[PDB]
């Protein structure tokens, strides 16, 4: 080096521009074999022997140890898609890494890097406006046929691909049950409110949808009943143990005769509190804290159930769905402690079922609201953990369609249509931005190339036909229904993706364009690396 003693190293020029791209293209090459209905899974083994089988892009990249700074940007990009949308986590990394690769050929020539960035921002802006021309509103088609198809499309390329027509009905019937009512401006459909429980056992066609709530808990003592028909839910948030004095309060005895009465009063305060609860007709007692064994005897002769150490996130949903109120103390607006009867819940069957040795507690037919929970049955622990992750991706797809009433055709019909519109749009610029826009059109065409390659098909004539069909959809207005073909990987011919039933929410493709362009800009503007030596 010579001058500039920084106690590190540095790389400048084309050395760092062609190294930030081989690091980005390698990460995209890992997940390039897990795209589309003909993609396979992967296996991940750590140093202790914990096996994870998955194909989604958010979980493979998260578990891998990556330390190249130009590669970690793509890893954090995938984690953004899973939170904002929830689907398309491997489709966005491929576009982002392809955009850099097409931009190197220009920068290695005498094209300034700022001319590429300006052209990229223009192409991303007009590619979103055109998509809104290519929109389909679900309400025109059948409501219950635009959700089964949209949910089943997200189910392909997973372990539950063949069982889509069974799992599609379950997902739709689980989202409509938790439809929250707003101030009548817009329905709200919360997710991660259903409880998904894994339990190995019978086949995956034996999974059941519970019309209520399911708890991963067991009853406290063996003497209590395990089936209550008309149950009165009383949700609590405090421990039913023996009382004791606080840190600042001590007991000093000067007369030996006043000792027995004091010791007796430690076990009497908690006795009165329980009697106040059971007198209103409570049948089931749910506590987030712990219950002493002396306090479990009062529920025995009373014919009541008591479940201890219940999670707070679970108690919130049980209380909301049954009409009960979560109270952290028995006090009221006066100095006394009371317990009215207008703040209990009401179910119609609380039965403790048994599933593969260990047990659980179901709560069925809640009258206040409707709730759902899903119990998954698989072969072993590896198979069930992949059915949960592939079911979460399906729940988020249905929520976006109901919220945003618009879908776009799947199977590569959008990128093939966008690579046509952007090609004739760049012909009206007449500047050095002409080259940048043409590269955006060619970079989008990578989705069909990786679909016809994973299917062991010819990816040259198939994509040649796709561009030929869509070129007739823009010109010749008498033929404008040719923009809904896409690609079929079961036979190898372009079918009608509109009639076949391949659909995708429009917020998936719009967001993936904006995230893939902003990530390509920040990597592209770097002409120097200094790496400091560790201390």
């Amino acid at each position: 080096e010579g001058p500039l003693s920084v106690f590190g190293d540095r790389s400048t020029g084309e050395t760092i521009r062609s190294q930030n791209v081989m690091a980005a293209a390698s990460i995209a090459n890992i997940v390039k074999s897990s795209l589309g209905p003909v993609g396979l899974d992967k296996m991940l083994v750590d140093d202790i022997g914990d096996v994870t089988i998955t194909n989604d892009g958010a979980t493979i990249l998260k578990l891998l140890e990556v330390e190249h700074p130009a590669a970690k940007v793509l890893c954090e990009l995938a984690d953004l898609q899973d939170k904002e949308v929830g689907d398309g986590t491997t489709s966005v990394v491929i576009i982002a890494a392809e955009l850099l690769k097409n931009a190197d050929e220009l920068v290695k020539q005498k094209i300034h890097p700022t001319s590429v960035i300006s052209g990229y921002r223009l192409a991303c802006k007009e590619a979103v406006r055109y998509i809104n021309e290519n929109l389909i509103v679900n309400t025109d088609e059948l409501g219950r046929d635009c959700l089964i198809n949209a949910a089943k499309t997200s189910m392909s390329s997973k372990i539950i691909g063949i069982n889509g027509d069974f799992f599609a009905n379950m997902v739709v019937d689980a989202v409509l049950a938790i439809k929250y009512t707003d101030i009548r401006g817009q329905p709200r459909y919360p997710v991660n409110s259903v409880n998904i429980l894994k339990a190995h056992g019978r086949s995956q066609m034996e999974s059941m949808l519970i019309s209520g709530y399911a708890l991963n808990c067991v009853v406290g003592s063996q003497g209590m009943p395990k089936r209550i028909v008309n149950a009165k839910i009383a949700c609590l948030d405090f421990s039913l143990q023996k009382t004791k004095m606080k840190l600042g309060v001590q007991v000093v005895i000067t007369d030996p005769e006043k000792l027995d009465q004091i010791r007796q009063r430690e076990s009497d305060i908690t006795k009165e509190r329980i009697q106040k609860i059971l007198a209103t007709g409570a049948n089931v007692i749910l506590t987030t804290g712990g219950i002493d064994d002396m306090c479990l005897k009062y529920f025995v002769e009373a014919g009541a159930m008591a479940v201890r150490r219940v999670l707070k996130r679970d108690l919130k949903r049980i209380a909301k769905a049954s009409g009960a109120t979560i109270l952290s103390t028995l006090a009221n607006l006066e100095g006394e402690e009371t317990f009215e009867a207008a703040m209990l819940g009401q179910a119609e069957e609380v039965v403790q079922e048994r599933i593969c040795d260990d047990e659980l507690i179901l709560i069925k037919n809640t009258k206040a609201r409707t709730s759902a929970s899903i119990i998954l049955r698989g072969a072993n622990d590896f198979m069930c953990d992949e059915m949960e992750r592939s079911l979460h991706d399906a729940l988020c797809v249905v929520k976006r369609v109901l919220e945003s009433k618009s879908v776009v055709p799947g199977g590569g019909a959008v990128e093939a249509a966008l690579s046509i519109y952007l090609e004739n749009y760049a012909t009206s610029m007449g500047s050095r931005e002409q080259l940048a826009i043409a590269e955006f059109a060619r970079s989008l065409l990578v989705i069909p190339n990786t679909l016809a390659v994973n299917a062991a098909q010819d990816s040259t004539d198939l994509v040649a036909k796709l561009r030929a069909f869509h070129n007739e959809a823009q010109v010749n207005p008498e033929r404008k229904n040719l923009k809904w073909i896409g690609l079929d990987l079961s036979n190898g011919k372009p079918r009608d993706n509109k009639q076949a039933g391949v659909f995708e929410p429009t917020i998936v493709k719009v967001k993936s364009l904006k995230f893939a362009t902003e990530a390509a800009i920040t990597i592209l503007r770097i002409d120097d690396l200094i790496k400091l030596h560790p201390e």
Partner: protein, 180 residues
């Protein structure tokens, strides 16, 4: 909450604690029930003074030597339709007082309906999954303060986007000092 009355507090709402080391001695079974009863009427007394003024949003300052809000005081406060916001730092009290115009209160006898700052809307927003945030807009007595929210996709873009804005503020500062 709409049409809220914000109020800053610097004292705590828990069991009574003095600066001197104190302790309570019990030598009879009848006094055990009084400690719980008289404790419960002390917290309830302070909550009933806040609702008398007509308060909707509460801002508690951070305290480390003693508890600032017990589970009993929160149970009473929810029953009176009041929003409670805890863990406020000691360095940004001035910026809060400069924005909504709120007299700080450090003693219960000084909690009067004039120590309060009005507002139009005070509600929490929910993002796409990146967290929650609090916005109080439409202050009746606005000051000379403003705030900016910076949004980005990566942690690297946010930092560069923040430094770029700070550069556009220093140029406007240069123009007022030397109008040339």
């Amino acid at each position: 909450v709409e049409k809220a009355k914000i109020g800053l507090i610097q004292f705590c709402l828990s069991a009574p604690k003095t600066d001197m080391d104190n302790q309570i001695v019990v030598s009879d079974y009848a006094q055990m029930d009084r400690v719980l009863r008289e404790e419960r009427a002390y917290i309830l007394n302070l909550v009933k003074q806040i609702k008398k003024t007509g308060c909707n949003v509460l801002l508690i300052q951070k305290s480390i030597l003693r508890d600032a809000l017990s589970d009993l005081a929160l149970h009473f406060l929810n029953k009176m339709k009041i929003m409670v916001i805890k863990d406020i730092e000691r360095e940004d009290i001035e910026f809060i007082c400069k924005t909504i115009g709120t007299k700080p209160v450090a003693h219960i006898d000084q909690f009067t309906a004039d120590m309060l700052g009005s507002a139009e809307l005070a509600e929490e927003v929910n993002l796409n999954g990146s967290g929650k945030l609090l916005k109080i807009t439409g202050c009746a007595s606005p000051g000379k303060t403003v705030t900016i929210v910076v949004r980005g996709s990566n942690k690297l873009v946010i930092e560069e986007a923040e430094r770029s804005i700070h550069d556009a503020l220093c140029v406007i500062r240069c123009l007022v000092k030397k109008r040339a």
